[PDB]
Design an enzyme around this catalytic site. Structure first.
Site, PDB file in Angstrom:
ATOM      1  N   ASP A 227       0.850  -1.160   0.000  1.00 41.59           N
ATOM      2  CA  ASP A 227       0.000   0.000   0.000  1.00 41.59           C
ATOM      3  C   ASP A 227       0.881   1.203   0.000  1.00 41.59           C
ATOM      4  O   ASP A 227       0.704   2.098   0.813  1.00 41.59           O
TER       5      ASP A 227
ATOM      6  N   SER B  96       2.892   7.477  -1.571  1.00 41.64           N
ATOM      7  CA  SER B  96       2.359   7.050  -0.308  1.00 41.64           C
ATOM      8  C   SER B  96       0.899   7.015  -0.553  1.00 41.64           C
ATOM      9  O   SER B  96       0.329   8.001  -1.004  1.00 41.64           O
ATOM     10  N   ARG B  97       0.252   5.872  -0.281  1.00 38.35           N
ATOM     11  CA  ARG B  97      -1.141   5.720  -0.582  1.00 38.35           C
ATOM     12  C   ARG B  97      -1.973   6.002   0.624  1.00 38.35           C
ATOM     13  O   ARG B  97      -3.187   6.078   0.502  1.00 38.35           O
ATOM     14  N   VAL B  98      -1.368   6.176   1.817  1.00 38.80           N
ATOM     15  CA  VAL B  98      -2.124   6.490   3.003  1.00 38.80           C
ATOM     16  C   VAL B  98      -1.811   7.900   3.362  1.00 38.80           C
ATOM     17  O   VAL B  98      -2.615   8.567   4.004  1.00 38.80           O
ATOM     18  N   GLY B  99      -0.668   8.411   2.864  1.00 36.59           N
ATOM     19  CA  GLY B  99      -0.345   9.810   2.728  1.00 36.59           C
ATOM     20  C   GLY B  99      -0.642  10.680   3.908  1.00 36.59           C
ATOM     21  O   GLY B  99      -0.069  10.513   4.977  1.00 36.59           O
TER      22      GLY B  99
END
Lengths: 499, 187, 168, 50, 468, 119
Positions: A341, A366-369
């Site tokens: 992720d 970053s996918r949760v950023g």
């Protein structure tokens, strides 16, 4: 002393009782003993040979149960009692494992006496479900300036560290472990991330170096290093991340926070290949075991961020994947990229070009950023993302008669890029990440020439400590930058730049 | 299904043979005839046990069968069909393998269990008897079943005894204990 | 060692029992292992090669591999339909599909079933699915138009009667 | 502290190889015979206790 | 019923030998009671000698060869009904949303033959969406599979949510969001977001029913999740008449999942690495979704091209089934326009003149031509400078940039999130709107009135208020 | 291999005496130096220089073990170290050799490396 301990030990072994089930090896070859017997055998259960090697029984075949030997071939020899241990693979788990280097089985390999553990938990248990998991919401500051600003890492969400072979991938990871010392040392138990580093397929010398480095930075006291070294048999290597996850579970379940860094899953894959092909299970794509996507997916999804119902625990994970020649189309990287992720993509060229850590700003995501990133650090480095983006685009234009606008970008961009380098094997506190980045963002350091950027960085920190460690302390504790704080900061930077 | 399964080829033949004679309800008859044909094969060593070499014809194989049923006319009839089958499938070469396998299956039906008391060297007859008594008495031998306890000599096992039967063992031996003992004092 | 289609314990036990499986399985079979979209039937002794067999469950298949002791049907239909130990009956024809004048304007299934749902197909004959093509001497070079009515597909690219002509 | 711990480790392996020397002596004795009797009765006691 | 003992557990392929009488038919479901719950094994071969070979739906660790198995008697039957709205239901068909046993009337086998050739719907027709961008430039096909393209960060989740809301108003249909290969993180988000945006209203009466298959699940269970979902949808279509719309998450991961199940079952691997049974298996999933004479399932599926190659066999096999593609793009969302639908990437099958109507076609072709010309124009408008243009060209630039803004539309699901009232503008009224903009009848209207506004009638209103 | 407990970290710097090596990636005593390189990129020349420098310098004995390299190369090495006196067959050699060469059966090539390790 030692004599007393031995005397205790001889006394500490007692006569046994009748042991249900037995086998006789039918043929043992290739580290895949195939035993005839073991009438009731639970699948994947640990079975112990006459010789003393331990094995697990991956294939329960219609007439023979195919044990995989966890040691050297020589130990087992055709026809010999094969005792049934009777407990599916499980490893000691507990708070007590903190500070011990343990092998896949769980035996102490650090040689600091018996591992005191509070439970033994199975090594294949299924990951937290849809309703147990609550979205990520607590920053994990890795302490590398580039990671913390460019690619925020939050509690409980796996993010890959995929990069070119031996570009000191492990170094990027190790840095994260060191920074956790800062929060760890204190007394706030909703801040301590207890890291576990899982060294899979690394030479024993390398893991010795790891052990020493951690001791040197006084970091073994929140570290557990599950190490299954290159020497260790291919089943042990196979079970090494799975075992590790179980070590992590005690932390997650008991409601601490923890970060388990699986290094490197590329070698985990190779071990699974070795087991499967040798057990004659059908081959598959790129000669990797057929269900290889399934194996990696099981491991990586045990990481999660538990809901407030379930005790608000976490288990951040950071797999490290070694990209062979940087070909991110390769089957083992591609599978992992999908599963994860996020990615941090360390690029060899950058490493050579002196940018160490060598995070390629463009190809990391970053996918949760924004769930992560300290609120303060978020405010003063939204800009940083955008500025660097321009610098990348205008990069190739650095080969003449260039617009003033283009030149402005180039000056700001070169200075920022130089600024984001971090000296290897030293982390940097978050309370000093926000000031340093502030300077570049506000363009104060644009004027400073490239060679002096480095000198400026250290100077700025000392200047901040002397002039206004009130400012620093406010930044640290408030953790959010109010306009008044940003005001004070602007002044401080102005003063610093002037000298 | 017949109690006691036999995995793999040649024992699929035995499995079939037993269940086939079980529905005829003439298993003792089968067993007796099987012993007899096996014995007169075994007792004809050159030419007819050493001419079970795999190279004979279809027609020559049939004629080997014809000689076999010439040798005695006492055969169950299910086992006369079995001789034909093994010849016809041209796996006649493994002849005794099926015989032994039928025996294993048969004496399970009879009830007999086999054990082993491996030791370093042969043990007392007094010991044999005491262990036999104990083992038969124990719940492990359910009774309504018998125990042919066999001491075997295995030098590798240093002293002690290991009881084996029902694929369940109790291993109290000096070699095995020494292994564990040594290991524990190397910690 | 090996394996055989007579390895199978149910087949094997019947033979051992002195039972003759001939004159039963001369024209019917009973299915053995099935699944993987090919089925293996034991018996069907008088089967023609590439005959159509109908499994009793309403699915038909074409015998593909006639092997010593087993005949291997290929199921023209879903796997779910044939369950092991089903009775296979010989249809008696090499796979043929009804052909005739009265097929005009009827959609038909691959086995020639009327899946148009307009009732039975009126068909002169049936003709075997694969048949040899007209040889060297039964043919004459093309000499008539096939008028496609698209300029270029009927001007630039000429297309006449009785000729292959790929559209790729 | 480091050498003290090293010396303890050195002691542990030294007394271990001495134990191996005593083991070679033990397996010689007709205790090798007499303990088979002990095992015999122990197995009798054990298997009847199930 | 019949019972049998587990006689192998090699990998996740568990072979069970049944006490001879009757073998479970291929595709039937066997349930082994386990101390972990149940394990549902599905028979995928008969190995001869009264043995079967199954694939597993729960992890295969800790089976003991000799466990009793019980045969359900047919494919896994998952509860179905309108009593199953707003429930996350796992592959085996049990609530995993932990709100207690799903009250249900009927359950139905998860493998059911596709609707007959007889029952195919003779003509094709357009399914009204209500998103203006969709209904104009690439209209959804009634009972077609319209494949969403473009990854997360394009408001993919919000777009998916929007569709659920519109469909409910538009037709009356439910939804079933079935997710194959869905990250456990993403699933948490979807459940939480869907609750928040009211498309699932736990207290209320939910729209979408959920079937979630995390990547954690065994290779077999990844393969069957889609088919499990399809069954839920079909109950709605067949027995409640409404057209419904069943989303699938990555359908790439349906293929990917299938690839594993083949490999485990031991079939020889086939071209590029995918299943030997690749074509037909995609067929079983993608032909049960069809327009029946009762209702129609319609499915918006998300295709994640592997290695960004549209030539690879897995995307290619997928592309055959697809009817329209709505290609959400991140560039487009970065130009402020939300819905994020890229106006010159989306293409539809039904979008041919005689399918969508002559008028609709003509309007569409013009809107496509204007935007298309605009992009090319924007190349040299930027390079040359804005001033350098023809009178004809700046007519187009003016016209186009007004169209470009006009595409936007604040919508109901994110009414809560943005605050702005949502606009669901009817398909007929969408066609009308663009006709006028093409004819420049509202070319006197300021450009900042076309941004984020509803239909043509609406932007008359906005023009007045903006001017004031 | 020696157990995890046995391992002990080290870092001492060997002086190769070769400019590229010395500056840009120095070799270290007790290390596992590795001369990775192509096919015929001058591998032999490099190895020969290394033997001249490092071997003579090194205090302890060495074992030069050849797993599957050409017997032409073998004879050259044998001759070269007889000349350089490393192998002094009058005196005592400060090196041992375990040459298994690529004319040897497929099996032997595999466990020839092991033979060398044991010396």
């Amino acid at each position: 002393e030692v004599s007393s301990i031995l005397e205790e030990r001889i006394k500490g072994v007692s006569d046994e009782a009748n042991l249900n089930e037995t086998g006789r090896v039918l043929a043992v070859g290739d580290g895949i003993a195939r035993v005839f017997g073991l009438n009731n055998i639970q699948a994947e259960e640990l079975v112990e040979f006459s010789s003393g090697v331990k094995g697990m029984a991956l294939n329960l075949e219609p007439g023979q149960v195919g044990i995989v030997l966890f040691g050297s071939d020589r130990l087992v020899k055709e026809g010999e009692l094969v005792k049934r241990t009777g407990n599916i693979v499980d490893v000691p788990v507990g708070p007590g494992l903190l500070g011990r280097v343990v092998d896949a089985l769980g035996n102490p390999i650090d040689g600091k006496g018996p591992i005191d553990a509070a439970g033994r938990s199975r090594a294949q248990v299924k990951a937290p479900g849809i309703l147990p998991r609550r979205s990520v919401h607590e920053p994990v500051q890795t302490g590398l300036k580039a990671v913390d600003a460019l690619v925020p890492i939050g509690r409980g969400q796996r993010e890959l560290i995929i990069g070119d072979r031996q570009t000191g991938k492990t170094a990027v990871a190790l840095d994260t472990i060191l920074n956790q010392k800062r929060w760890n040392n204190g007394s706030d138990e909703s801040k301590k991330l207890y890291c576990v580093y899982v060294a899979v397929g690394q030479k024993r010398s390398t893991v010795a170096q790891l052990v020493q480095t951690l001791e040197q930075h006084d970091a073994m006291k929140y570290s557990i290093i599950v190490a299954a070294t290159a020497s260790e048999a291919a089943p042990l290597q196979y079970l090494a991340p799975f075992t590790a996850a179980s070590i992590g579970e005690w932390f997650r379940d008991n409601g601490k926070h923890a970060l388990i860094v699986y290094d490197d899953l590329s070698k985990q894959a190779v071990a699974y290949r070795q087991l499967s092909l040798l057990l004659r299970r059908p081959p598959g794509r790129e000669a990797y075991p057929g269900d290889v996507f399934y194996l990696h997916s099981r491991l990586l999804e045990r990481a999660a961020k538990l809901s407030e119902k379930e005790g608000s625990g976490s288990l951040t994970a950071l797999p490290v994947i070694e990209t062979q020649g940087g070909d991110v189309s390769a089957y083992i990287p591609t599978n992992v990229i999908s599963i994860t992720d996020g990615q941090i993509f360390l690029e060899a060229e950058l490493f050579y070009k002196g940018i160490r850590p060598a995070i390629n700003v463009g190809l990391s995501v970053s996918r949760v950023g924004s769930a992560a990133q300290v609120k303060a650090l978020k405010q003063v480095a939204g800009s940083l993302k955008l500025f660097l983006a321009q610098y990348r685009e205008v990069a190739a234009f650095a080969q003449s008669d260039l617009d003033a606008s283009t030149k402005q970008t180039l000056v700001r961009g070169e200075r920022l890029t130089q600024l984001l380098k971090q000296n290897q094997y030293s982390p940097l506190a978050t309370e000093e990440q926000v000031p340093l980045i502030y300077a570049g963002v506000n363009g104060h350091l644009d004027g400073i020439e490239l060679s002096r950027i480095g000198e400026f960085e250290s100077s700025f920190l000392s200047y901040l400590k002397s002039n206004h460690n009130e400012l620093l302390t406010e930044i640290r504790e408030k953790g959010e930058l109010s306009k008044e704080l940003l005001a004070s900061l602007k002044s401080a930077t102005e003063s610093f730049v002037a000298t | 299904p017949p109690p006691v399964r036999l995995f793999g080829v040649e024992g699929t033949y035995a499995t079939a043979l037993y269940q086939a004679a079980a529905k005829n309800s003439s298993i003792d008859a089968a067993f007796q005839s099987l012993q007899k044909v096996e014995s007169t094969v075994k007792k004809n060593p050159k030419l007819g046990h050493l001419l079970l070499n795999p190279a004979l014809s279809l027609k020559d194989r049939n004629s080997v069968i014809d000689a076999i049923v010439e040798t005695h006319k006492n055969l169950d009839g299910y086992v006369v069909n079995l001789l034909k089958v093994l010849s016809e499938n041209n796996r006649l070469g493994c002849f005794e393998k099926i015989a032994s396998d039928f025996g294993v299956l048969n004496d399970a039906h009879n009830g007999l269990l086999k054990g082993t008391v491996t030791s370093a060297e042969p043990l007392d007859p007094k010991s044999f008897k005491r262990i036999e008594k104990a083992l038969s008495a124990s719940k492990l031998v359910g009774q309504g079943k018998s125990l042919k306890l066999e001491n075997v000599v295995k030098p590798e096992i240093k002293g002690g005894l290991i009881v084996e039967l029902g694929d369940k063992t109790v291993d109290l031996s000096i070699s095995t204990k020494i292994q564990k003992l040594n290991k524990v004092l190397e910690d | 060692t090996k394996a055989q289609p007579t390895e199978v314990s149910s087949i094997l036990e019947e033979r051992i029992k002195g039972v003759s499986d001939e004159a039963n399985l001369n024209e019917t079979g009973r299915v053995l292992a099935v699944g993987d979209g090919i089925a293996r039937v034991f018996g069907l002794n008088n089967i023609q090669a590439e005959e159509l067999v109908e499994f009793s469950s309403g699915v038909k298949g074409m015998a593909l591999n006639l092997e010593p002791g087993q005949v291997g049907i290929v199921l023209f239909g879903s796997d779910r339909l044939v369950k092991e130990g089903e009775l296979v009956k010989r249809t008696g024809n090499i796979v043929d599909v009804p052909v005739g004048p009265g097929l005009l304007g009827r959609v038909v299934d691959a086995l020639g079933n009327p899946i148009d749902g307009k009732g039975p197909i009126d068909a002169a004959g049936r003709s075997r699915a694969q048949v040899k093509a007209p040889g060297i001497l039964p043919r004459r070079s093309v000499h008539e138009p096939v008028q496609t009515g698209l300029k270029a597909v009927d001007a630039l690219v000429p297309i006449g009667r009785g000729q292959r002509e790929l559209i790729i | 502290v480091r050498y003290e711990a090293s010396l303890r480790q050195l002691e542990q392996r030294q007394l271990a190889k001495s134990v191996i020397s005593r083991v070679q002596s033990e397996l010689g004795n007709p205790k090798f015979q007499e303990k088979v009797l002990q095992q015999s009765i122990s197995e009798i006691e054990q298997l009847l206790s199930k | 019923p019949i019972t049998g003992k587990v006689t192998a557990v090699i990998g996740a392929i568990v072979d069970v030998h049944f006490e001879q009488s009757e073998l479970p038919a291929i595709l039937n479901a066997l349930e082994i009671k386990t101390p972990q719950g149940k394990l549902v094994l599905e028979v995928a071969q008969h190995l001869g000698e009264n043995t079967v070979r199954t694939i597993a739906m729960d992890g295969t660790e800790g089976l003991v060869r000799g466990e009793k198995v019980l045969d359900t008697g047919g494919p896994i039957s998952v509860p179905v009904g309108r009593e199953t709205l707003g429930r996350i239901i796992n592959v085996i068909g049990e609530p995993i949303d932990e709100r207690g046993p799903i009250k249900s009337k009927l359950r139905k086998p998860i493998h059911a033959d596709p609707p007959s050739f007889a029952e195919q719907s003779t003509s094709a027709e357009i399914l009204e969406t209500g998103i203006k961008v969709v209904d104009l430039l690439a209209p959804y096909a009634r009972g077609g599979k319209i494949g969403l393209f473009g990854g997360a960060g394009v408001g993919k989740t919000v777009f998916i949510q929007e569709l659920i809301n519109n469909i409910a108003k538009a037709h009356g249909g439910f939804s079933v969001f079935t997710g194959v290969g869905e990250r456990t993180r993403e699933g948490n988000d979807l459940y939480r977001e869907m609750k928040e945006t009211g498309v699932i209203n736990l207290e209320g009466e939910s729209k979408v029913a959920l079937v979630f298959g995390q990547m954690n699940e065994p290779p077999g269970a990844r393969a069957r999740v889609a088919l499990t979902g399809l069954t839920i949808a079909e109950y709605f279509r067949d027995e409640e008449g409404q057209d419904v719309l069943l989303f699938i998450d990555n359908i790439f991961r349906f293929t990917q999942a299938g690839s594993e199940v083949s490999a485990l079952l031991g079939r020889i691997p086939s071209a590029v690495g995918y299943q030997p049974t690749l074509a037909t298996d995609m067929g079983l999933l993608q032909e049960r979704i069809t327009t029946t004479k009762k209702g129609s399932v319609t499915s918006v599926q998300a295709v994640y091209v592997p290695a960004d190659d549209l030539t690879d066999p897995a995307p290619a096999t997928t592309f055959a089934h697809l009817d329209a593609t709505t290609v959400l793009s991140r560039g487009i969302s970065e130009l402020g326009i939300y819905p994020a639908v890229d106006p010159l990437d989306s293409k539809s099958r039904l979008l041919d003149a005689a399918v969508v109507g002559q008028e609709h076609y003509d309007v569409a072709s013009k809107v496509q031509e204007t935007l298309q010309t605009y992009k090319s124009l924007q190349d040299i408008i930027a390079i040359l400078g804005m001033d350098e243009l023809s009178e004809q060209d700046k007519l187009t630039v003016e016209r186009a940039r007004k169209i470009q803004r006009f595409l936007s539309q604040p919508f109901a699901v994110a009414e809560v999130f943005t605050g702005i009232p949502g606009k669901l503008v009817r398909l007929k009224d969408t066609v009308a709107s663009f006709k006028a903009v093409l004819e420049g009848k509202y070319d006197n209207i300021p450009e900042h009135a076309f941004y984020m506004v509803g239909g043509i009638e609406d932007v008359v209103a906005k023009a007045e208020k903006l001017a004031a």
